[PDB]
Amino acid sequence: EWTGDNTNAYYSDEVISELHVGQIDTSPYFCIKTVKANGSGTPVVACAVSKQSIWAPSFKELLDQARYFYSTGQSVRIHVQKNIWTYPLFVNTFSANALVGLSSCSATQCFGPK
Amino acid sequence: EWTGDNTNAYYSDEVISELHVGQIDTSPYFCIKTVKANGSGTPVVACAVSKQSIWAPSFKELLDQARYFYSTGQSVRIHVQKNIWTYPLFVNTFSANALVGLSSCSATQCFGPK
Amino acid sequence: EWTGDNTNAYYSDEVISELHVGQIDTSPYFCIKTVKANGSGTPVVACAVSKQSIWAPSFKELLDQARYFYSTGQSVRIHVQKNIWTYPLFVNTFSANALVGLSSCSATQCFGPK
Amino acid sequence: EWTGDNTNAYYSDEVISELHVGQIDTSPYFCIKTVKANGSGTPVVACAVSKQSIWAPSFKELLDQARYFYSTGQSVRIHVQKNIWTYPLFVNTFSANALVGLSSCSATQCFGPK
Amino acid sequence: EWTGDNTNAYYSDEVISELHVGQIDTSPYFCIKTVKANGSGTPVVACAVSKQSIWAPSFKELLDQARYFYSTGQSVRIHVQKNIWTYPLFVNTFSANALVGLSSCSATQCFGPK
Ligand SMILES: CC(=O)N[C@@H]1[C@@H](O)[C@H](O[C@@H]2O[C@H](CO[C@]3(C(=O)O)C[C@H](O)[C@@H](NC(C)=O)[C@H]([C@H](O)[C@H](O)COC(C)=O)O3)[C@H](O)[C@H](O)[C@H]2O)[C@@H](CO)O[C@H]1O
Ligand SMILES: CC(=O)N[C@@H]1[C@@H](O)[C@H](O[C@@H]2O[C@H](CO[C@]3(C(=O)O)C[C@H](O)[C@@H](NC(C)=O)[C@H]([C@H](O)[C@H](O)COC(C)=O)O3)[C@H](O)[C@H](O)[C@H]2O)[C@@H](CO)O[C@H]1O
Ligand SMILES: CC(=O)N[C@@H]1[C@@H](O)[C@H](O[C@@H]2O[C@H](CO[C@]3(C(=O)O)C[C@H](O)[C@@H](NC(C)=O)[C@H]([C@H](O)[C@H](O)COC(C)=O)O3)[C@H](O)[C@H](O)[C@H]2O)[C@@H](CO)O[C@H]1O
């Protein structure tokens, strides 16, 4: 598996606008919401759950990188795998998107797979 | 269990105004005090104890996130479970509230369970 | 045991003014010096030694919090247990005080036991 | 092996201009892109994969230092070993360079092997 | 053993001027270069190797502290044990000094052994 697999979705020119940390089923988790830097489109919500999904091994690196990009407000590409989380009230509050990578974005390209 | 269970309480548009770190019964712990950004309401105090309560697995993430939000002074939602901590002098100094999540707020927003 | 036990001493309205990191007997340790925010009184010197004293479990959280409050320069209450360290040259350089907690202070009170 | 082996390559007077974090084959990884501080030359890309290559033991230190130099924007020397990564779509997106060290640079010399 | 052993050397009123991170013999390492705040004297170089020397247990704490003092540029006392590293290309690039402690300095004294 790879962040860059074409079975994963991605959204360019996004800004991490919200950050949440919590716990579910003995597992710390975090969620982010991102919006287009230019104000178009609809928001993206993605979460990482420490003890769950094939992406669990990168939980710490993703949380640290999310905090970093959240704190600068820079434009990034968010990479997700859709339809991962399954507890309905969790998905309702957040989404079923697993966060699988984060890329900085230059003026006219993003530094990550497409 | 989940941060967003309806048996947990939450408080919105709060600012983390104080932070304490200590040890009790061989456990590092931390506590926070939050006040409404606009000066209304009554202060909220919540604590996390590494090694105690069902929320112990999320101690590190919550301590890191509390420090982050403390440093920015931004408005947040604090999620708690009431009536958890026992030692009466500890409760009297701080509270019996376990900290169970932290969410950012964007203009009385709050990105977390509701 | 608890940071707030009345067998521990505390000092309010202090600022962390020096920081040292070293190793002794295979243990990383750190020490801090605090002074009253108004410059009155005598400095408080306290140390934490990674594998030693009943306060060993909180070494990492105390080191991180000491660095945090040192870098902000904000007023704090420092909590210590006296007469812990024993190596004379170490005690003469620093002190015998074990660091057992750190509380942020407002202008009117400190967020911690007293 | 050593960062400074003459079988590694290095590039001086660079600035870390992009940063990406993801997961591949159960390993967190990160990649950076660097460009000449003075606008000359061609960009350099290098990656570190947490449990792959001889350089895996330094994954955390390299990620922390890459983030540090990325956030300061200061001039650095980047050290790489060529032709390490092999998944073609990964190499196409980033490169086959393994990141093996990072050195601060003054206006005249870089503090690292040469 | 102790940072303050009289068999260790130290240099007061120094500023950390350069920082390098790499790997040698499967171990992360870092080096720092320091110069007198007054711009006098010869530079001091010292290195820490995770996994090597009796000071290996404090590698993480010294790296974190070196990074901190590097970012502030404040005056510090550097504590070293001479003649520890022996790979000649390494020593010639950096030095044989093992870093064994870091102390903040005021105007009257540095907060560490002497
Ligand atoms: C009238 C019309 O043509 N409308 C658009 C068309 O403009 C868009 O084409 C370009 O898309 C560009 C960015 O492409 C990505 C991206 O990098 O973010 C590619 C992603 O593969 C795609 N992700 C998914 C799951 O499809 C992503 C999203 O479509 C997009 O980011 C919207 O996200 C949200 C939640 O709002 O876009 C860039 O946006 C250029 O402006 C576009 O011209 C086209 C693709 O977006 O769709 C047509 O409807
Ligand atoms: C006349 C009247 O109705 N007065 C108030 C009414 O205005 C309040 O409604 C709005 O509440 C908003 C905040 O809502 C929450 C919050 O998210 O912070 C919902 C929480 O569920 C609630 N938590 C608990 C345990 O009750 C929390 C607290 O009630 C509130 O934060 C005060 O807490 C403290 C310690 O001070 O409020 C917002 O404040 C709007 O401006 C209000 O219009 C309503 C809810 O507070 O109660 C009525 O008594
Ligand atoms: C006519 C001519 O000879 N042109 C250039 C010549 O100017 C260059 O000489 C000086 O090189 C200086 C930098 O040296 C290094 C470096 O530290 O960056 C040595 C490195 O070993 C080398 N790395 C590799 C893998 O070969 C590196 C790269 O060549 C260089 O950094 C460019 O890399 C990229 C991706 O653009 O240079 C410095 O640049 C001086 O200003 C130069 O005068 C000479 C070496 O670059 O090459 C000749 O073609």
Numbering used by the authors:
A (entry chain D), B (entry chain C), C (entry chain A), D (entry chain E), E (entry chain B): 24 to 137
Show me the paper's own sentences about this structure.
Typhoid toxin belongs to the bacterial AB toxin family and consists of two enzymatic ‘A’ subunits, CdtB (cytolethal distending toxin A subunit; nuclease) and PltA (pertussis-like toxin A subunit; mono ADP-ribosyltransferase) linked to a homopentamer of receptor-binding ‘B’ subunit PltB (pertussis-like toxin B subunit), resulting in its unique A2B5 configuration. PltB recognizes the specific trisaccharide motif as its receptor, N-acetylneuraminic acid (Neu5Ac) α2–3 or α2–6 linked to the underlying disaccharide, galactose (Gal) β1-3/β1–4 linked N-acetylglucosamine (GlcNAc) or glucose. The pentameric configuration of the receptor-binding PltB subunit per toxin and the three glycan binding pockets per PltB monomer play an essential role for multivalent interactions between the toxin PltB and glycan receptor moieties. We previously revealed the three glycan-binding sites (BS) per PltB monomer and demonstrated the flexible use of these three binding sites in accommodating glycan receptor moieties that are structurally different.
We also solve co-crystal structures of PltB homopentamer bound to Neu5,9Ac2α2-6Galβ1-4GlcNAc and compare the glycan-binding interface with that for unmodified glycan counterparts. Both unmodified and 9-O-acetylated α2–6 glycans bind only to the BS1. 9-O-acetylated α2–6 glycans bound only to the BS1, while 9-O-Ac α2–3 glycans bound to the BS1 and BS2. Notable differences between the two are H-bonds between the 9-O-acetyl group and Thr65 (via the main chain), as well as between GlcNAc and Lys59 in the interface for 9-O-acetylated α2–6 glycans. These results are in support of the increased binding affinity of PltB to 9-O-acetylated α2–6 sialosides, compared to unmodified α2–6 counterpart. PltB binds to 9-O-acetylated α2–3 glycans (Neu5,9Ac2α2-3Galβ1-4GlcNAc) with a ~14-fold increased affinity compared to its unmodified α2–3 counterpart (Neu5Acα2-3Galβ1-4GlcNAc), while PltB binds to 9-O-acetylated α2–6 glycans (Neu5,9Ac2α2-6Galβ1-4GlcNAc) with a slightly higher affinity than its binding to unmodified α2–6 counterpart (Neu5Acα2-6Galβ1-4GlcNAc). Similar to PltB pentamer bound to unmodified glycan receptor moieties, we did not observe conformational changes of PltB pentamer bound to O-acetylated counterparts, compared to PltB protomer of typhoid holotoxin.
